[PDB]
Amino acid sequence: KQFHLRAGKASYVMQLFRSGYLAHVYWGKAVRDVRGARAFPRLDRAFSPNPDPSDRTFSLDTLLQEYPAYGNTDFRAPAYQVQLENGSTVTDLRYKTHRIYKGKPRLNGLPATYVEHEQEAETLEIVLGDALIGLEVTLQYTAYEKWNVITRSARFENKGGERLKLLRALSMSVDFPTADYDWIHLPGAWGRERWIERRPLVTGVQAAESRRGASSHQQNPFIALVAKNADEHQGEVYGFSFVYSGNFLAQIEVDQFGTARVSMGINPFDFTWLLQPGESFQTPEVVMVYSDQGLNGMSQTYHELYRTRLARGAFRDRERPILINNWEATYFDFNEEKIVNIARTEAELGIELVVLDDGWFGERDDDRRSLGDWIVNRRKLPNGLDGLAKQVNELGLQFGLWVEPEMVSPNSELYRKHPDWCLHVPNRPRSEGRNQLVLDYSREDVCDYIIETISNVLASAPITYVKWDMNRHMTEIGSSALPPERQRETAHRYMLGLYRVMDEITSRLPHILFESCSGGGGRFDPGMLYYMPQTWTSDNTDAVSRLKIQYGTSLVYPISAMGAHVSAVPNHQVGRVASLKTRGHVAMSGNFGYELDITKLTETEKQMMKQQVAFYKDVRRLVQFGTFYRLLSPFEGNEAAWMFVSADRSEALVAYFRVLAEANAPLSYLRLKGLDSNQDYEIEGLGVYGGDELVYAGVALPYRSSDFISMMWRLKAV
Amino acid sequence: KQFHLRAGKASYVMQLFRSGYLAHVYWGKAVRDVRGARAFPRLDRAFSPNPDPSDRTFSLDTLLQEYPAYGNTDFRAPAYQVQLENGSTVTDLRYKTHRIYKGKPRLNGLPATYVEHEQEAETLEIVLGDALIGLEVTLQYTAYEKWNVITRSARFENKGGERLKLLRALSMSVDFPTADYDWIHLPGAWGRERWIERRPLVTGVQAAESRRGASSHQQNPFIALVAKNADEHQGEVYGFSFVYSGNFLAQIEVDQFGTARVSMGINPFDFTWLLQPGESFQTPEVVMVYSDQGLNGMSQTYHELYRTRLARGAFRDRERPILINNWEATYFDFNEEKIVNIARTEAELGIELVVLDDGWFGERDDDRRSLGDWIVNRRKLPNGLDGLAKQVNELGLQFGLWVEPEMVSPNSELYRKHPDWCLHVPNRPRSEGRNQLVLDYSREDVCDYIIETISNVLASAPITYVKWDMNRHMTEIGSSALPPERQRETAHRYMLGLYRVMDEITSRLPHILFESCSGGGGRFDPGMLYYMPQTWTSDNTDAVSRLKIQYGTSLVYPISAMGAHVSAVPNHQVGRVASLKTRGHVAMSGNFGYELDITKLTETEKQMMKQQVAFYKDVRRLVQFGTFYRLLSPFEGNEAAWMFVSADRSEALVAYFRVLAEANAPLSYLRLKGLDSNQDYEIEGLGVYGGDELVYAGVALPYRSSDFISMMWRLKAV
Amino acid sequence: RVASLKTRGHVAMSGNFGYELDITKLTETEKQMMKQQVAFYKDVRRLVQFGTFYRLLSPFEGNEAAWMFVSADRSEALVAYFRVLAEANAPLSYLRLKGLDSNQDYEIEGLGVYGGDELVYAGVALPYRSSDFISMMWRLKAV
Amino acid sequence: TLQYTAYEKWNVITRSARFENKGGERLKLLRALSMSVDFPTADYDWIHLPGAWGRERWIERRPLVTGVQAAESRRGASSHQQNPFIALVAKNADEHQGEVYGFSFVYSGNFLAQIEVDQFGTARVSMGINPFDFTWLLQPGESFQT
Ligand SMILES: OC[C@H]1NC[C@H](O)[C@@H](O)[C@H]1O
Ligand SMILES: OC[C@H]1NC[C@H](O)[C@@H](O)[C@H]1O
C-alpha cells in the first residue's frame, strides 16, 4: 500500500502503516522505488506510548507522518487539532480511500497554482477519516510534470452529528528521517523586507510566523531546509511556500530521535473554526519544491511556476510597462496641473505609464482621513479622473490609479454612516494604525459595497493600471455579524472576503494590470500574486538597500513581479547618496519604473533617464521572463551580483554591485552561470570571451573607486 | 515611577509608561539607578499601530513589557490570553497599585522557593487590572539578598460578572533591548537527559517545550541567554528555570527591531482554564538568575538556592546515604531470601541503605500488571515488608522502598474496581505506555485514596527512604469528573493533585528521605525538588554516558540532588566496558550509591567498593554541599573535568576524565578554579602546589593509555 | 583499546589486508573468524585493491566512519560502516552511497535488492546496534 | 628549464625544474623548489596532513591567512609529522563536490609545502625541497634536477 508521486526530477513517497496510518517515506531526487520503505529498525522507545498496548515498537511519537495529531501517543506539534463537544481534543484519522486524476483542482475561495492542460500535472487525494466523530479529512497532493513541484492542502468535512471546532488546521506536515540541516527564512521589517537568514536547526522548535492578519514584512511565508554544504549553485534544498496572504505558521520541529517535522499553514494562534454537521473547511496550499542545484535551482522552479501557473490575467506573459509614480515626488501635495505639465516630459523620455498615487480621493491632503470615500477631489482634480486620464492618454501615456479599499478612516463619510463596518470588538477602544481602521471583509455587505464602488471608479476613466495598497495590520480582531463562537474565524474570513473582492473586481476589468502593495512588500506572497501579477517590492527605494531586498525576494518570487523604481537622492528612507547610474542598474534588475520629481532633476539626469528607458526596453523580455541566477550575495559581503539568461542561452545580461570602496583594492573577478560553455559570448563594450571561460575561469572586473558602484554588460553569443 | 529590585549583585528595573503601562527597563549587574530609562528615541515604527491615534511614537508592538498581551497593538507572542463570553480575545491590563513586603509568599497549591527569615528577600506585587471585564492580575516579583535571584509568577482573579477563559497563562515574560545572544537549553531523551545545546538566536521563534504532562527527558524546563563570548568562567548569563513538573513552554522571540522576548510558563498548547466570577489562578514560579561569572557563576547560584531554599524536609542539609539498588541486579526476579542473603556483604562493604525496587507489590513479575495494587506479594516476600525491613535494620542498614502511585495497570484489582479513575476521554481507545495507564489526579477521590494507601504502606515497616517513580507520559488527557468546558484543565489539575498528594505523604512521614524518579531524570525539575530533596538522574548508568548527563544536569541542579550509582559491565544501556575505578569516580561526583550484582563481582573488586564507599564518606560533605566548578566539557571534546571546593576554600576535590585514548598523545594539563591564590595546596598523591599556580598555570597530568580513564585528587590547604 | 576481532578485520580489509598477532594466544572462536576473514577478503581483494574508492563518513567530523569500493564497470561494490562511541536510545542511522549506476538495482548480500538511485539519493537504514567500536560490511552486486 | 607534463586521461599536471650552469662562475642554489603558482584570488581553505608516530596523516582543514602558511619536514625524511601534500579547496567544497587543487611532492626527504597570501589577495603555492639547511653548488657545467 504505497503512494508514489513523481514531480519533475523528484519523488514524494508515502505509505500505509499497520491499520490505516499514513506514513511519510521519502522526498528528494527521483527514484524508481524505495525498497527499504519498511526495512527500518522497529524499536521500543522509552516514554513513547502505544495505540496498541501489545506492541511497544509502534508509537505515533516515533512514526513519520503526513498529517499528525496530538493526543493519541504523538507528543510532537500536530498538523491539526479538533475539539469535541465533550471537551476532549483527541482525534484519530485512518485511511478510508483515495483517488488519482490528471490535472489540478481549484481550492474553494482560495488562490492556488493551476494548470492549463490535464497532462501538466496529476493529483492524488487521500481521504482520511475518524469514524467516531464523522470527521473526514482529504489530503490533496499535486505533482507537476515539468517542475519539481509538490503542492499540499487539506480539506476538512464534518459528516457527523455533532459540532467540531477546529483549533488548528495547517496546510501540510512532513517528517524528515534526519535533521542535519540548516534552515532559511525571510525575516525583515518595513523598508527592509525579506533578508536571507540562514541558521542551523535546534533540538526543539523554530518558527517564522505572522499574527498581523497579513503575510507581513516581518516574516515572509516561506521557509527552507538546506543541506549543510548547500549554496546558491549546488546542494539539496527543500522549499516551503505558502499561498496565503494572512496569518501563517511556518514551523520546524526536531525531536529526541533526530527527526525534523516541517509544518506550514494558517497560524493556529488566536484561530478557531466551527464546523456544523455538513460544513467543510478548505486550507490554502503549500508549494513544496526540491532541488539538488542549490538555491538558484529552487528559485528558478518557483520563478517559472509562479509566473506561468499562479499569476493570471492578460498581462501574465506580457512585458510590463515602464511607469512613473508620483508618491515620493509630491506625496499628497499635487494637482491636475502639475501632473499634466510634467506628463509631456515623461512621454519624451520613453515612459509608458503615469500612475496617480494616494491623495486623489476625498480630502486626502494628508494620511489622516478620507479612506473609504472613493470620490474624486475636485479641488485637486477639477476635470476628474476621466479628464486627467484623457490629457494623459493623448500624450501617448497610459494612466494608473491608487486604491486602498480594505481600509476606512474614522474621519470619513463611510465611517460616519457605517461605524460597525470595521474590525472591532464590543466596548474596546478601536486602535488605529496610520490614523485608520480596517474594514470588516468578513461581512457580505461590506465586500459587496467595495466590489461595486471600486469597479465603477476604475471604469469611470480609461484606466489600465491599478495599485492596490494596504498600510495597516489588524487589531481588535472581531465582527458584529459573527456569533461569539465564530469570532476567532474573523481574520481568515477577512482574507477570504478579500480574495473574493479581488477576484470579482479583476474579472470585471481584464484590461487592467493590477499591482498588489502593502507599505512596500507587506503582502509579497503567492496568494496576492494569484490576483495581481506584480507587487511593489518595498517602500525602500535606495539602490544599496534594494540589493538585499531584491536578492531575498528573488529567492522565491519571480522578477516579473518584483517592482523596482528609480528614486531621488538623498534617499527618503535612508538618506544615502547613490549615483543615478547605480539606481538604474538596481531597478533594471526588477520590474523597472521611476518614482521621483523630474522637475528637480538636472539636464544630465534627465538625459540619463532617456538612455535608461531605451536600454531597459531592449532587455525587458530578458529581465522579466528569462532565467535568473544569483552570483554574489549582499548578505555575505561587500558585493552583489546576478544575471539574466534567455531560454536558448544566446543572450544574457549581467549586473555587478560593490557598496563600500576599498583603497588599493585587490583585483576583482566575476564568474558567471547558465551560459553555454560550448559557445563564445561577446560582452558589449568589453570584447569577446569564451563561455567556458566566463563560468570556469571568470572575467577580470574594471578597477573603480567611489562608493556604491554598478556595472551592466549585455552578452550575446557569436 | 520606577520599580527597582536588587537581587544580590544584580538589578531588575521596571517603570510605568504613560497611561499605566508596565514596562521593562533593565536586568543585569547591579546599578544605583537607570537614569536613562526614558532617554530612548521615540520613533514612528511603520505597521506598528497605536493605542493613542495622535501619537504614532507609542505602540505595544515596540514597548518592552513585563506581561504583554495580544490584540491591542502588539503582534509578538503574549504572556497570556483571555477569551471573553462574547468571543473576543482582547484584554487590556493597566496599573492600579503595588505593595512591597519583606520575605516571600507561598504559592497556592504550588511549589516555590522560600525563605526562613524576612530579611533574606523582598517581594514586590504589582497589581494590574482590566476595568472592563473585572480581571485582576497580580505580578509577583521576589529578589533575594545574597543571591542574584529574581523569581516571577502571576496570579489571576475574576472580580467581574462574566466568565473568563485563560487560553494562556505564562509565569513570566521579559523584553531585552538587544538580541545579540546565544541561547542554551537542555534537550535529551531517555538514557541521555539534559545535553547542553548552544545555539545562535534566530529572527523569529525558538522554543523548548513539553506536551507530555511531565517536564520530560526530551526538554528540561530551562533556557538561558548568554553573551557570544560567555563560557564557564566569564561572561553575562541569563538563566530561566521553571519550578513546575508538568507541561511547559520556554520560548524566545526576536522581533523586527532586534529585541528578544523570553517567556516561560505552563504550555498554552492543549491548555485552557475557566475562571468563574470570584475564582482565581496562580501560575508556577520561574527562577531567574543573572551572572557575569559565566555558566559556573549561574549554576552555583542555583545550587545554593535550590539546595537550601527549595528542597525541604529533615534531610535538606543532611548528608545523603550511600545506598544500593537492586533494579539492574535482579530486576523483577528476586525474593526475601536473596535480599537478606546479600545484605550481609552489603553491610560489611560500608553501604548505609538497602533500596527495594520494582517487583515487591501485587504480582509484579513483569512490567505488565499490578500497578495500583500496593500490597506486598507474599510469594516473593513471605515475611512481608515488615519482615524484610527488620532483617535489614539488624545488620545496621536503613531500608528503602520503590513506588509508582501515579499509575495503574489494566491488569490490576484497582482498575477492575475503578476503570474510570484513569485519565481518559469518551469512546476512545485507552493508549498504554509500558502497559499502564495514568491515574486521574484531578479527582479528589483518587488523590485521597493514594494519600491514604501509600501512607499506610510506608508506615507498615521501618522505612526511611522512598523512590517515587513514574514510567509513562499522559495520552487521551481527560477527566470524567470534569465539565466539557474544563477538560483542558486536566493536565494542570493532575499536577496540582500530585503536588497535593506528595505534600501530604511527605508530611505524614517526616523521617523518610524521598527521591523522585521518572524513568531516570524524566522529571528532574525544581518543582519535584521542592517535595523530594533528590532525584534519580538517569537510567543510563554508564560512566562515560553519565559524563554528559551529570555535566548537563549540574548546570541548573545541585550535586546533592543528583543521584549516581555504580553499575555492572558491560553496561545495560550501551554495552560499554569501563573500569570500576572510572564508574566510581563518575558516581562519586554526585549523590553516590550502587546498583549492580555484588555476588557476580570478584574479590579484588569488592575490596575497591569498600575503599570507594570509605572514600566518599570522607568527602561526602564536600561533594554534596561544596561549591561546584565545571572545568572541561564532554560536549566540546574528548575530556570531562570538574571539581568541588569547600566554603572556606581550604579543601577541594578534583575529578578528571578522558574518554578515547590517542596514541603518542600530547601532554595533558588542567587548570583549576575557585581556589585561594594566596595559599598553597597539597594534592594528595602528587605533591604541594600553589593555589595561584593551579588556577593560572595548571597542573601537568600523568600520561596514561587505555579508554575511559579517570583521576581523582583531594586537595588540602597547608 | 579493546575492539572486537570483527571490526579489526573490517578495518584491515579496507586496506592492504594482513595479520600481525600471536596466533597461539588466540581462542578457538577467534581463529575460526580469522579463517573466514581470510577467505572473505580473497573474494573482494581485487575490488578493494584496484577499485574506485569513495569516502562517505569522516571520523574527523563525527562519531562515524564510512567508505566504499566500486568496480570499474560499477557492477560490484563493498560498503563499510563504523560507529565508535555508542549512545543510548540513539536516533536511527542512515547511509547514502556513491559511485553506483542509478539506473541499476543492486543486491546487498543478506539484506535484499535496493535501487541504485535509492542507495544514492535516499540511502539505506542501518541496523540499530549497541556496544562500542562496531562495524558493518555489505557486498553489493548489480542485478 | 621548467618541465610541464599533462596526462591525457587524468586531470594531472606534473611540474619540476632543471637548473644548468652554462656560465664561467659557480652559482650557489640557496633554494630550488619544484614548482610555484600564483592564484589570482585567495578565498580558499587549505588541507594538509599533519600527525605523529602512531597517528599519521590526520586531515586538517583551515582557512587561509593573509601571510605565510606551510607544512614542512626538517627530518631528512617526509616524516610522520607532516605528509608532503597540501590542497587548496573551495570554501564549500566537500568529499563529493567543489573545486579542489591538490599538490603532491614525489620526494621522500625534506620538503616545503607553502601557501602565501599577499596584500592583493593572490595566493602563491610553492612546493619542493625544503630551503632550510639546504644549499646546492653548481660549478660551470653542472646541473641540478628538482
Ligand atoms: O500612502 C501611499 C504609499 N503607501 C505605501 C506604498 O507602498 C507607497 O508606494 C505609497 O503608495
Ligand atoms: O521499573 C523500575 C524502574 N523504573 C525506572 C527507574 O528509573 C528505574 O531505576 C527503576 O526503578
Side-chain angles (χ1 to χ4, degrees), chain A residues 190 325 327-328 331-332 357-359 364 367 402 404 434 467 469-471 517-521 536 538-539 565 595, chain B residues 47:
Chain A
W190 176 90
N325 195 283
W327 170 244
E328 295 193 8
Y331 293 111
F332 296 112
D357 212 80
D358 186 17
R364 284 289 271 200
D367 59 340
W402 179 96
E404 189 174 346
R434 201 190 183 181
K467 182 178 176 180
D469 194 12
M470 183 204 69
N471 300 272
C517 176
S518 177
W536 182 227
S538 180
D539 279 346
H565 298 167
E595 190 167 334
Chain B
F47 290 80

Side-chain angles (χ1 to χ4, degrees), chain A residues 680-685 687-689 714-718:
Chain A
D680 296 330
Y681 289 85
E682 178 185 356
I683 302 186
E684 188 185 58
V688 172
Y689 291 79
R714 303 181 61 185
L715 281 69
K716 290 181 178 296
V718 294

Side-chain angles (χ1 to χ4, degrees), chain A residues 45-54 56 61 70-78 81 83-92 94 130-133 167-168 183 185 187-190 192 197 199-209 211-213 217-219 247 251 253-254 256-258 269-270 272 367-368 425-435 470-477 482-485 487-488 518-520 522 539, chain B residues 45-54 56 61 70-78 81 83-92 94 130-133 167-168 183 185 187-190 192 197 199-209 211-213 217-219 247 251 253-257 269-270 272 367-368 425-435 470-477 482-485 487-488 518-520 522 539:
Chain A
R45 300 295 197 171
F47 288 79
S48 290
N50 322 115
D52 193 336
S54 304
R56 302 191 182 186
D61 196 40
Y70 172 85
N72 48 15
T73 69
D74 196 344
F75 289 113
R76 298 173 288 185
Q81 191 178 39
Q83 189 176 39
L84 276 54
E85 291 183 5
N86 56 20
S88 70
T89 49
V90 171
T91 55
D92 188 26
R94 307 291 186 93
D130 190 337
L132 179 61
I133 62 181
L167 301 179
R168 179 189 298 240
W183 75 295
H185 62 297
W190 176 90
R192 43 182 176 95
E197 177 165 314
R199 291 288 183 275
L201 297 179
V202 315
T203 306
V205 176
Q206 314 93 288
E209 59 178 282
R211 310 180 185 94
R212 299 169 174 270
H217 331 247
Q218 290 70 21
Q219 295 285 4
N247 294 312
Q251 190 177 263
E253 186 177 17
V254 173
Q256 54 188 329
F257 302 131
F269 176 78
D270 199 52
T272 69
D367 59 340
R368 300 166 51 190
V425 288
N427 305 111
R428 290 294 188 183
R430 303 175 178 183
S431 302
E432 303 180 10
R434 201 190 183 181
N435 292 123
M470 183 204 69
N471 300 272
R472 195 198 190 281
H473 291 153
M474 296 165 48
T475 51
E476 289 87 20
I477 308 175
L482 290 178
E485 46 275 351
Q487 284 291 331
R488 302 270 49 79
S518 177
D539 279 346
Chain B
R45 300 300 197 164
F47 290 80
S48 296
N50 319 109
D52 175 26
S54 62
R56 299 187 181 182
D61 191 36
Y70 175 85
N72 51 343
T73 70
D74 197 354
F75 295 104
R76 295 170 292 183
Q81 189 180 24
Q83 183 170 30
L84 279 53
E85 295 192 20
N86 69 344
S88 70
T89 47
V90 171
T91 62
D92 190 25
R94 306 288 186 89
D130 192 338
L132 182 67
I133 62 180
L167 301 178
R168 176 189 296 230
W183 75 293
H185 65 298
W190 176 91
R192 46 183 177 97
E197 180 167 308
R199 289 292 185 273
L201 289 175
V202 321
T203 307
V205 177
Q206 332 87 11
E209 61 186 286
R211 315 176 186 92
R212 301 166 173 267
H217 316 70
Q218 290 71 30
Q219 296 285 359
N247 295 317
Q251 189 176 262
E253 186 184 21
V254 176
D255 74 326
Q256 56 185 331
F257 300 132
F269 175 74
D270 208 44
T272 59
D367 59 340
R368 292 182 170 90
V425 292
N427 308 115
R428 293 295 192 184
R430 299 181 180 182
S431 298
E432 302 181 30
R434 201 194 182 185
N435 290 125
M470 177 192 75
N471 299 282
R472 194 201 183 278
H473 286 153
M474 300 163 44
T475 57
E476 292 84 22
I477 307 171
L482 286 180
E485 65 273 22
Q487 282 295 330
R488 305 271 50 79
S518 178
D539 279 340

Side-chain angles (χ1 to χ4, degrees), chain B residues 327 332 357-358 402 434 467 469 471 517 519-520 536 539 595:
Chain B
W327 172 246
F332 297 103
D357 211 79
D358 198 352
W402 179 97
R434 201 194 182 185
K467 182 180 176 181
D469 203 351
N471 299 282
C517 181
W536 182 225
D539 279 340
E595 191 171 330

